[PDB]
Design an enzyme around this catalytic site. Sequence first.
Site, PDB file in Angstrom:
ATOM      1  N   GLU A  60      -9.039 -16.875  -6.764  1.00 21.67           N
ATOM      2  CA  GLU A  60      -7.763 -16.172  -6.644  1.00 21.67           C
ATOM      3  C   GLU A  60      -6.743 -16.996  -5.845  1.00 21.67           C
ATOM      4  O   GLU A  60      -5.569 -17.081  -6.234  1.00 21.67           O
ATOM      5  CB  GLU A  60      -7.937 -14.801  -5.996  1.00 21.67           C
ATOM      6  CG  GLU A  60      -6.608 -14.074  -5.819  1.00 21.67           C
ATOM      7  CD  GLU A  60      -6.675 -12.851  -4.894  1.00 21.67           C
ATOM      8  OE1 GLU A  60      -7.231 -12.979  -3.775  1.00 21.67           O
ATOM      9  OE2 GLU A  60      -6.149 -11.775  -5.290  1.00 21.67           O
ATOM     10  N   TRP A  82      -7.153  -8.746 -11.294  1.00 17.21           N
ATOM     11  CA  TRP A  82      -5.809  -8.409 -11.734  1.00 17.21           C
ATOM     12  C   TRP A  82      -5.678  -7.863 -13.163  1.00 17.21           C
ATOM     13  O   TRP A  82      -4.557  -7.630 -13.658  1.00 17.21           O
ATOM     14  CB  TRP A  82      -4.914  -9.614 -11.533  1.00 17.21           C
ATOM     15  CG  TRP A  82      -4.784  -9.955 -10.110  1.00 17.21           C
ATOM     16  CD1 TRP A  82      -5.671 -10.657  -9.339  1.00 17.21           C
ATOM     17  CD2 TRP A  82      -3.691  -9.610  -9.256  1.00 17.21           C
ATOM     18  NE1 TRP A  82      -5.189 -10.770  -8.053  1.00 17.21           N
ATOM     19  CE2 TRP A  82      -3.975 -10.132  -7.980  1.00 17.21           C
ATOM     20  CE3 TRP A  82      -2.490  -8.915  -9.450  1.00 17.21           C
ATOM     21  CZ2 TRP A  82      -3.100  -9.981  -6.907  1.00 17.21           C
ATOM     22  CZ3 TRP A  82      -1.624  -8.774  -8.391  1.00 17.21           C
ATOM     23  CH2 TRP A  82      -1.931  -9.300  -7.137  1.00 17.21           C
ATOM     24  N   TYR A 146       2.273 -13.230  -6.052  1.00 15.27           N
ATOM     25  CA  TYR A 146       2.232 -14.183  -4.944  1.00 15.27           C
ATOM     26  C   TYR A 146       2.489 -15.648  -5.257  1.00 15.27           C
ATOM     27  O   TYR A 146       3.163 -16.329  -4.476  1.00 15.27           O
ATOM     28  CB  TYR A 146       0.921 -14.091  -4.208  1.00 15.27           C
ATOM     29  CG  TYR A 146       0.727 -12.818  -3.470  1.00 15.27           C
ATOM     30  CD1 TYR A 146       1.130 -12.698  -2.151  1.00 15.27           C
ATOM     31  CD2 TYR A 146       0.094 -11.743  -4.070  1.00 15.27           C
ATOM     32  CE1 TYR A 146       0.904 -11.537  -1.447  1.00 15.27           C
ATOM     33  CE2 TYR A 146      -0.143 -10.585  -3.382  1.00 15.27           C
ATOM     34  CZ  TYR A 146       0.262 -10.486  -2.070  1.00 15.27           C
ATOM     35  OH  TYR A 146       0.001  -9.346  -1.370  1.00 15.27           O
ATOM     36  N   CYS A 198       1.437  -6.658  -0.431  1.00 19.70           N
ATOM     37  CA  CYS A 198       0.874  -6.092   0.782  1.00 19.70           C
ATOM     38  C   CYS A 198       0.849  -7.188   1.823  1.00 19.70           C
ATOM     39  O   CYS A 198       1.083  -6.949   3.017  1.00 19.70           O
ATOM     40  CB  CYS A 198      -0.520  -5.562   0.510  1.00 19.70           C
ATOM     41  SG  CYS A 198      -0.539  -4.203  -0.656  1.00 19.70           S
ATOM     42  N   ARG A 218       1.808  -5.192   5.519  1.00 22.31           N
ATOM     43  CA  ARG A 218       2.428  -3.880   5.600  1.00 22.31           C
ATOM     44  C   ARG A 218       1.473  -2.715   5.369  1.00 22.31           C
ATOM     45  O   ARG A 218       1.629  -1.657   5.978  1.00 22.31           O
ATOM     46  CB  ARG A 218       3.625  -3.776   4.635  1.00 22.31           C
ATOM     47  CG  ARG A 218       3.301  -3.940   3.143  1.00 22.31           C
ATOM     48  CD  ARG A 218       4.506  -3.489   2.284  1.00 22.31           C
ATOM     49  NE  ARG A 218       4.146  -3.234   0.890  1.00 22.31           N
ATOM     50  CZ  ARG A 218       3.320  -2.271   0.496  1.00 22.31           C
ATOM     51  NH1 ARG A 218       2.831  -1.400   1.377  1.00 22.31           N
ATOM     52  NH2 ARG A 218       3.036  -2.139  -0.792  1.00 22.31           N
ATOM     53  N   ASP A 221      -6.277  -1.587   3.133  1.00 21.76           N
ATOM     54  CA  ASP A 221      -7.442  -0.755   2.875  1.00 21.76           C
ATOM     55  C   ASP A 221      -8.501  -1.454   3.723  1.00 21.76           C
ATOM     56  O   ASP A 221      -9.099  -2.437   3.279  1.00 21.76           O
ATOM     57  CB  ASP A 221      -7.765  -0.812   1.366  1.00 21.76           C
ATOM     58  CG  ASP A 221      -9.048  -0.056   0.970  1.00 21.76           C
ATOM     59  OD1 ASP A 221     -10.005  -0.008   1.773  1.00 21.76           O
ATOM     60  OD2 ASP A 221      -9.127   0.452  -0.185  1.00 21.76           O
TER      61      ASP A 221
HETATM   62  C1  LIG Z   1      -7.301 -10.620  -1.926  1.00 22.49           C
HETATM   63  C2  LIG Z   1      -7.450  -9.440  -2.082  1.00 22.49           C
HETATM   64  C3  LIG Z   1      -7.483  -7.985  -1.908  1.00 22.49           C
HETATM   65  N1  LIG Z   1      -7.551  -7.181  -3.145  1.00 22.49           N
HETATM   66  C4  LIG Z   1      -6.274  -6.646  -3.706  1.00 22.49           C
HETATM   67  C5  LIG Z   1      -5.988  -5.180  -3.591  1.00 22.49           C
HETATM   68  C6  LIG Z   1      -4.980  -4.628  -4.415  1.00 22.49           C
HETATM   69  C7  LIG Z   1      -4.814  -3.222  -4.495  1.00 22.49           C
HETATM   70  C8  LIG Z   1      -5.640  -2.345  -3.748  1.00 22.49           C
HETATM   71  N2  LIG Z   1      -5.514  -0.998  -3.829  1.00 22.49           N
HETATM   72  C9  LIG Z   1      -6.319  -0.163  -3.115  1.00 22.49           C
HETATM   73  N3  LIG Z   1      -6.292   1.155  -3.327  1.00 22.49           N
HETATM   74  N4  LIG Z   1      -7.197  -0.661  -2.223  1.00 22.49           N
HETATM   75  C10 LIG Z   1      -7.419  -1.995  -2.150  1.00 22.49           C
HETATM   76  O1  LIG Z   1      -8.461  -2.475  -1.366  1.00 22.49           O
HETATM   77  C11 LIG Z   1      -6.633  -2.895  -2.900  1.00 22.49           C
HETATM   78  C12 LIG Z   1      -6.804  -4.303  -2.829  1.00 22.49           C
HETATM   79  C13 LIG Z   1      -8.742  -6.864  -3.727  1.00 22.49           C
HETATM   80  C14 LIG Z   1      -8.794  -6.725  -5.123  1.00 22.49           C
HETATM   81  C15 LIG Z   1      -9.973  -6.282  -5.740  1.00 22.49           C
HETATM   82  C16 LIG Z   1     -11.135  -5.968  -4.995  1.00 22.49           C
HETATM   83  C17 LIG Z   1     -12.292  -5.440  -5.719  1.00 22.49           C
HETATM   84  O2  LIG Z   1     -12.278  -5.255  -6.941  1.00 22.49           O
HETATM   85  N5  LIG Z   1     -13.386  -5.179  -4.996  1.00 22.49           N
HETATM   86  C18 LIG Z   1     -14.775  -5.405  -5.469  1.00 22.49           C
HETATM   87  C19 LIG Z   1     -15.695  -5.213  -4.273  1.00 22.49           C
HETATM   88  C20 LIG Z   1     -15.514  -6.263  -3.221  1.00 22.49           C
HETATM   89  C21 LIG Z   1     -16.188  -5.894  -1.927  1.00 22.49           C
HETATM   90  O3  LIG Z   1     -15.622  -5.065  -1.182  1.00 22.49           O
HETATM   91  O4  LIG Z   1     -17.283  -6.428  -1.654  1.00 22.49           O
HETATM   92  C22 LIG Z   1     -15.336  -4.671  -6.683  1.00 22.49           C
HETATM   93  O5  LIG Z   1     -15.460  -5.317  -7.749  1.00 22.49           O
HETATM   94  O6  LIG Z   1     -15.670  -3.471  -6.549  1.00 22.49           O
HETATM   95  C23 LIG Z   1     -11.116  -6.146  -3.593  1.00 22.49           C
HETATM   96  C24 LIG Z   1      -9.923  -6.595  -2.971  1.00 22.49           C
HETATM   97  O1  LIG Z   2      -5.576  -7.200   0.955  1.00 21.70           O
HETATM   98  C1  LIG Z   2      -5.119  -6.169   0.446  1.00 21.70           C
HETATM   99  C2  LIG Z   2      -4.053  -6.023  -0.595  1.00 21.70           C
HETATM  100  C3  LIG Z   2      -3.634  -4.759  -1.075  1.00 21.70           C
HETATM  101  N1  LIG Z   2      -4.211  -3.654  -0.574  1.00 21.70           N
HETATM  102  C4  LIG Z   2      -3.847  -2.224  -0.881  1.00 21.70           C
HETATM  103  C5  LIG Z   2      -3.043  -1.577   0.245  1.00 21.70           C
HETATM  104  C6  LIG Z   2      -3.019  -0.125  -0.204  1.00 21.70           C
HETATM  105  O2  LIG Z   2      -4.337   0.454  -0.046  1.00 21.70           O
HETATM  106  C7  LIG Z   2      -2.725  -0.155  -1.696  1.00 21.70           C
HETATM  107  C8  LIG Z   2      -1.224  -0.072  -1.935  1.00 21.70           C
HETATM  108  O3  LIG Z   2      -0.632   1.189  -1.446  1.00 21.70           O
HETATM  109  P1  LIG Z   2       0.864   0.934  -0.904  1.00 21.70           P
HETATM  110  O4  LIG Z   2       0.873   0.207   0.370  1.00 21.70           O
HETATM  111  O5  LIG Z   2       1.695   0.172  -1.856  1.00 21.70           O
HETATM  112  O6  LIG Z   2       1.410   2.317  -0.635  1.00 21.70           O
HETATM  113  O7  LIG Z   2      -3.199  -1.550  -2.063  1.00 21.70           O
HETATM  114  C9  LIG Z   2      -5.222  -3.702   0.393  1.00 21.70           C
HETATM  115  O8  LIG Z   2      -5.781  -2.681   0.787  1.00 21.70           O
HETATM  116  N2  LIG Z   2      -5.630  -4.951   0.869  1.00 21.70           N
END
Ligand SMILES: C#CCN(Cc1ccc2[nH]c(N)nc(=O)c2c1)c1ccc(C(=O)N[C@@H](CCC(=O)O)C(=O)O)cc1
Ligand SMILES: O=c1ccn([C@H]2C[C@H](O)[C@@H](COP(=O)(O)O)O2)c(=O)[nH]1
Lengths: 316, 316
Positions: A60, A82, A146, A198, A218, A221
């Site tokens: 990524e 994505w 990004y 984020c 900002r 999770d």
């Molecule tokens: C860079 C970056 C952050 N990101 C981006 C990102 C974007 C939107 C989000 N939206 C929400 N609701 N919570 C998030 O944690 C989140 C994270 C991530 C993207 C995907 C996975 C994911 O699919 N998790 C795995 C499990 C990984 C683990 O926790 O061990 C899976 O396949 O279930 C994790 C982080």
């Molecule tokens: O490293 C990262 C990138 C994105 N998000 C998450 C943040 C929020 O859980 C969700 C977006 O909600 P908003 O902040 O847009 O309201 O995606 C994470 O948790 N960790």
Amino acid sequence: MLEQPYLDLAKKVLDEGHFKPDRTHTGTYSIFGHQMRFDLSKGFPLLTTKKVPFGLIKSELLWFLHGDTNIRFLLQHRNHIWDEWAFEKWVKSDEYHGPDMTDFGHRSQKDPEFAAVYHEEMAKFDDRVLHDDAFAAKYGDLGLVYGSQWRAWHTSKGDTIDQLGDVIEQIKTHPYSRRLIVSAWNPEDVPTMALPPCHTLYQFYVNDGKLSLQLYQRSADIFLGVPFAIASYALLTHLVAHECGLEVGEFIHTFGDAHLYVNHLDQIKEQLSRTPRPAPTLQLNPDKHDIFDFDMKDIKLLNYDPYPAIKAPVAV
Amino acid sequence: MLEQPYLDLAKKVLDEGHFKPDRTHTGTYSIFGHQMRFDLSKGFPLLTTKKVPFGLIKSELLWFLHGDTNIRFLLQHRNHIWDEWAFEKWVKSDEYHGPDMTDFGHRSQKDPEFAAVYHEEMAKFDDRVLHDDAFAAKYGDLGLVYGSQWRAWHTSKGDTIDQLGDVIEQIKTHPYSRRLIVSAWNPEDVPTMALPPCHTLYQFYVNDGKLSLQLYQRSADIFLGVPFAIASYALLTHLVAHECGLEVGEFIHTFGDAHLYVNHLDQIKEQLSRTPRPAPTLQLNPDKHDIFDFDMKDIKLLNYDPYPAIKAPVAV
Ligand SMILES: C#CCN(Cc1ccc2[nH]c(N)nc(=O)c2c1)c1ccc(C(=O)N[C@@H](CCC(=O)O)C(=O)O)cc1
Ligand SMILES: O=c1ccn([C@H]2C[C@H](O)[C@@H](COP(=O)(O)O)O2)c(=O)[nH]1
Ligand SMILES: C#CCN(Cc1ccc2[nH]c(N)nc(=O)c2c1)c1ccc(C(=O)N[C@@H](CCC(=O)O)C(=O)O)cc1
Ligand SMILES: O=c1ccn([C@H]2C[C@H](O)[C@@H](COP(=O)(O)O)O2)c(=O)[nH]1
């Protein structure tokens, strides 16, 4: 132990955390404003109390570093992080002549059969992105991500600025600079963005021959998102330095809304029952010096002994 | 006591602070990454250990809040905080047919007579800005300043976005929003800016009926600059809330390069010898509700008992 800040972070949200609803109608416990410090010179901060897919982070990050915005790259790397963003676009478009897919990601949780169909359509979509080149240029390009924000910021004159590129060059020519900033936030774009960044902005810094980075997040999770971010950026700081002939300083993570979704609460105490073990060592290819050219094989993670991976539901 | 974080901040830079040269060739002791917390519900955080000109903060804030970028406003208020930026433009231009003014601000320190001449020219310049309306529209408009960044962000389509305006409206319609962000950093503008914004970005937040703000400052002059910023933003958080029918939460200041110039070291220990006394109470006019309409008289600071003002040289 290195990763302690993250545990202390979680443990804290559980305590001082005030209930607060969010977009995705799940409940979340929050703390606004928090900053944590990782000395990247004692080990790589890739959590050991729970298995985190470094392979994913790796691919990524490169993606971004190439100023790339199409899915294809991640697919050609097993990364599907994505997919939904591209898949969604594909479903709301004229060509998607399949079954019901509206709200797919949320319905999947309580599927009537939906899971199997969604998971299969995704294969169809992904595959063609991967193969049908015209289809790829149409549904694999997320556009504003990004990479294009770091490397191809579109100006008011129809040009593109390679923020990250320059920040690197600047670091080399004026290491003690106070304006080594890459910005992911564009006032015009967010108003119509699926998910405004984020990882909003980060700042580089040099001193005593060491490089440091501060990320301003900002919204995070704690359980699912925060672990990845640490690795993602902590890596960038390693890569950039190598390219600058610099030592490695610290990774500083500043938070806006640090939160822990309710549905996550059980899994997180679980993690807090674990004792972290020694943190893995990152190893960067010593021959290649232009990070923008680094390829998946040029980054090695030595000694990553972690506790089994804890599963948890995603709330969109 | 409320203001303690600032004292603790200074005291800390003196200790952990590592020497580091900067742009203005003065030496500075630095710490990268620091975040401090002020509970705006216990008192206004306007330092009591050293007299700080709240009157200035007040007028400067309004200026911004009107999306205004011309000097005239501050002049019509006794504020000269932005003179040099406009005056400089005036000197490097065709019309400035006076004496030597190149590097004025730095030469003033070791003036051959320069001080009196510079200080007098400034009167000439200021006066005409104040009076000669055409001259004002030519040399009083700094152009790109916090106000036009908050309230008139120019898009790639020749339009303007009123970031701050919307953030306010958003707060009213979606208080639990995670994207309540106003950005002062524009990738295209800084590359040719006299002084890229220091108060880079801030984020709003709501919970339990209280409003909170986190400012991300990339670079700060602990002694001279940091005290003003606290008041400036701590005020904004008060004003915005009043306008939102919200209670007041916390002011959170996050730092990139917090620094203390060498020439300041003596004056700062001096401040640390003082014991802070009760913090002043801010009082906002209860009739006026649209902050953008607030005028100098609509903001009152009750009970501001402070220690005499400590002077110190400015390093450009
Ligand atoms: C860079 C970056 C952050 N990101 C981006 C990102 C974007 C939107 C989000 N939206 C929400 N609701 N919570 C998030 O944690 C989140 C994270 C991530 C993207 C995907 C996975 C994911 O699919 N998790 C795995 C499990 C990984 C683990 O926790 O061990 C899976 O396949 O279930 C994790 C982080
Ligand atoms: O490293 C990262 C990138 C994105 N998000 C998450 C943040 C929020 O859980 C969700 C977006 O909600 P908003 O902040 O847009 O309201 O995606 C994470 O948790 N960790
Ligand atoms: C908002 C804002 C921050 N700002 C903006 C700002 C912009 C560039 C800077 N540049 C440098 N070198 N240091 C700074 O503190 C600084 C501050 C300020 C602007 C002016 C004064 C000023 O002229 N000081 C008063 C003394 C005030 C006091 O300390 O009591 C003077 O007239 O001497 C202070 C803060
Ligand atoms: O509240 C503020 C605003 C601006 N500045 C300062 C920060 C630096 O001292 C100087 C700019 O130097 P650079 O960060 O641009 O290098 O102006 C402050 O100190 N405090």
